[PDB]
């Protein structure tokens, strides 16, 4: 596979690759580069879907240096009158947005944290895409 780099910080080396056979490109950026200590910034995303990203949601499979975790389920937008603007688009329509984020309050030890993302959408509820993240962490 190919290696998609994103950014570097004092204690972060985020990167990602594809998981499944479909390889529809995508573009992601974060500023400033995350520090695994509680940060705040913006996230720019540019994409061109292939299914109706309506009532989308996420499944998350986490791995802390070879120790699995339960499966996380995040509902992005649901039903009618959603908070986000982009999740009423259709096939072929370009999505190009930026969203703000921030967190703080947990200590993470050294390791090779790894995550598995699954986006589900559509009225028949098919998968949309899938990626594999890699995050090193070496506190100073």
């Amino acid at each position: 596979q190919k290696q998609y780099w994103v950014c570097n910080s004092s204690d972060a080396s985020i990167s990602y690759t594809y998981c499944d056979k479909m390889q529809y490109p995508i573009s992601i950026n974060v500023n400033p580069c995350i520090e695994l200590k509680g940060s705040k910034g913006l996230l720019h995303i540019f994409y061109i879907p292939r299914r109706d990203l309506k009532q989308l949601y996420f499944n998350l499979y986490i791995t802390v240096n070879t120790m699995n975790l339960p499966k996380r389920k995040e509902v992005i937008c649901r039903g009618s009158d959603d908070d986000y603007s982009f999740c009423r688009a259709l096939k072929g329509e370009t999505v190009n947005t930026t969203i703000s984020f921030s967190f703080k309050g947990i200590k993470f030890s050294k390791g090779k944290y790894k995550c598995v993302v699954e986006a589900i959408s559509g009225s028949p509820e098919e998968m949309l895409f899938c990626l594999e993240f890699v995050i090193l962490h070496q506190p100073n």
Binding site: D81, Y84, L90, K91, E93
Partner: protein
């Protein structure tokens, strides 16, 4: 066949297959052909002939430059077109020539410039028309709309529209009958001359995040005069820029219209008073709020006439105090802020729903906490902690009730369900309770559905509590860590049909407790550890039984009690999955199906 057949001889899809022309080897009488991401730099006359019958088409991101005349000619029954993403620099006039029955049409991201240079004048029965994300300048409806009929939606949002004029919508005056769910959002606009919307009648109108400051909003609301809409929606979107300030001065004068529903969505400001705000939004027969953070307001109580109310994903400091004289339904779900509860007074109310909030109670249930006299439905699931200190007194007409995944207290100290003599549904599941008082189900003489899964029992022995429930049919009790049953518990329950007893810890099986149940069909013993019976006195089951799980549990394969295996293989006409009954207790006999093996001794 490179194009994938997903359903034979009716639907054939194929996307991203690097084609350059329409595939023909597909069957003749095919419908709803999909075609996406296949570069077709230009379309030719009669491009679609080998498919005389066709319901749905699609050309999504198939890079198109020019569609010429005569297209879709040899084509009827085509009800849907999707021309998304294809940058069309020249739509040939006369296109869409022969389309007898078309209803939906979608043209998004197509670089249009106006609406009158759009050749649908011969059309009819067209219901929806979505045209968004384009480059349009004026909201001047063309004239062929007079010819148009049965149009329902017209969704032109996120364009470069700037203002309106009374000359617009001079057409559509001459429509005695009309339903139009118009819509326009995300439009940068700053002025409407008065009188534009006048004597018109819509059925919806959505304006979210199309203003830049408060005074602009005041002027624009002044621009609306006499709209008479049946449903209005305001607010903004989180993803982009929003407003900075919001008070009673804003949104005023909105009651020069004639509205009957309202919906504000996602304010980003910390509003602080709801009275004298929303002030003349009375007589509105519905009301709702979504994702608004009014974290500090004192007097929620007032006299509005609201027959329906919704508070979804809001935030709060206190639980609101309500005093409404005619409010027939309430829905207070998914909120986050406060964790308490208080008294309300709703003298004529017939529906509650307080779910997933996470709040707490004390002295839970009585007619003095809701001030009503006839409450038909009630749901209290997924909250924090409830305490019972009064059996439901004054609520003699209540037919639905749920408590699952809450945390109950003091449930076994007295008859908690004693006045409800007309009840049908009841669910107490995964509440951390402990049944230790025979007769806790005293007084319920009409129950038919009963659910309790995950509720321990005193010393793990089932007592005789199922009496006077002479209509029960669906009885659920599983994952309750039972270890034995009373000899005569299921008596007089002559109407049961479903009986779930899975995932417990049994060791013996006996047919005596279920001797006289003349209506059973399903019987469930799945995730137990059954090794044998008390003895071979295993009688016949009631004839009506026709379904019986006995799977997913470890057996012991030794010639000891081989008569038990003889008895189970004696009646195979009631098992389910004979391949998943296998023993593993003896090391040799492992994974081998039971009914297959034959034993010595």
């Amino acid at each position: 066949e490179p194009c994938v057949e997903v359903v034979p001889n009716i639907t054939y899809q194929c996307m991203e297959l690097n084609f350059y022309k329409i595939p023909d080897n597909l069957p003749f009488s095919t419908k709803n052909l999909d075609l996406s991401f296949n570069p077709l730099r230009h379309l030719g006359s009669y491009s679609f002939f080998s498919f005389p019958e066709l319901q749905v088409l699609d050309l999504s991101r198939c890079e198109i430059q020019t569609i010429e005349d005569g297209a879709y000619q040899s084509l009827s029954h085509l009800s849907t077109l999707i021309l998304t993403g294809n940058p069309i620099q020249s739509l040939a006039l006369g296109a869409f020539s022969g389309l007898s029955s078309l209803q939906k049409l979608v043209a998004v991201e197509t670089n249009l410039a106006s609406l009158e240079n759009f050749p649908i004048g011969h059309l009819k029965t067209l219901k929806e028309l979505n045209v968004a994300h384009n480059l349009i300048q004026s909201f001047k409806l063309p004239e062929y709309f007079s010819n148009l009929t049965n149009l329902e939606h017209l969704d032109l949002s996120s364009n470069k529209i700037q203002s309106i004029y009374c000359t617009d919508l001079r057409v559509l005056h001459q429509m005695p009958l009309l339903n139009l769910s118009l819509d326009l959002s995300l439009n940068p606009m700053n002025f409407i001359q008065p009188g534009a919307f006048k004597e018109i009648r819509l059925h919806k109108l959505t304006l979210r995040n199309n203003f830049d400051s408060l005074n602009v909003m005041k002027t624009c609301i002044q621009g609306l005069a006499g709209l008479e809409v049946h449903r209005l929606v305001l607010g903004e979107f989180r993803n982009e820029g929003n407003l900075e300030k919001f008070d009673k001065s804003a949104l005023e004068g909105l009651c020069n219209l004639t509205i009957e529903e309202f919906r504000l969505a996602y304010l980003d400001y910390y509003l602080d008073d709801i009275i004298d705000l929303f002030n003349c939004l009375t007589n509105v027969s519905s009301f709702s709020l979504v994702s608004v953070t009014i974290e500090r307001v004192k007097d929620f109580s007032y006299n509005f006439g609201w027959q329906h109310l919704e508070l979804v994903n809001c935030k709060f400091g206190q639980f609101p105090t309500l005093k409404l004289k005619s409010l027939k339904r309430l829905t207070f779900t998914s909120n986050k802020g406060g964790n308490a509860f208080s008294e309300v007074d709703l003298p004529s109310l017939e529906f509650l729903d307080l779910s997933r909030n996470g709040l707490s109670f004390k002295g839970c249930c009585s007619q003095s906490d809701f001030g009503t006299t006839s409450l038909k439905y009630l749901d209290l699931s997924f909250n924090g902690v409830i305490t019972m200190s009064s059996n439901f007194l004054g609520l003699e007409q209540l037919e639905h009730l749920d408590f699952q995944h809450s945390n109950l207290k003091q449930m076994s100290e007295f008859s908690v369900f004693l006045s409800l003599r007309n009840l049908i549904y009841l669910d107490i599941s995964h509440t951390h309770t402990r049944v230790a008082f025979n007769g806790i189900f005293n007084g319920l003489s009409s129950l038919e559905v009963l659910k309790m899964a995950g509720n321990s029992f005193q010393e793990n022995f089932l007592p005789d509590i199922f009496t006077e429930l002479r209509n029960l049919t669906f009885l659920d009790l599983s994952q309750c860590q039972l270890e034995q049953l009373s000899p005569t518990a299921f008596n007089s329950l002559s109407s049961l049909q479903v009986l779930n007893m899975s995932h417990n810890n049994f060791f013996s099986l006996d047919t005596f407790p279920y001797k006289c149940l003349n209506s059973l069909q399903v019987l469930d013993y799945s995730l137990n550890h059954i090794m044998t019976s008390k003895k071979q006195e295993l009688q016949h089951f009631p004839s009506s039984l026709a379904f019986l799980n006995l799977t997913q549990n470890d057996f012991a394969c030794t010639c000891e009690h081989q008569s038990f295996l003889q008895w189970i293989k004696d009646q195979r006409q009631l098992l389910v999955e004979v391949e998943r009954m296998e023993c593993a207790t003896p090391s040799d006999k492992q994974g081998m199906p039971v009914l297959s093996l034959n034993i010595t001794c």
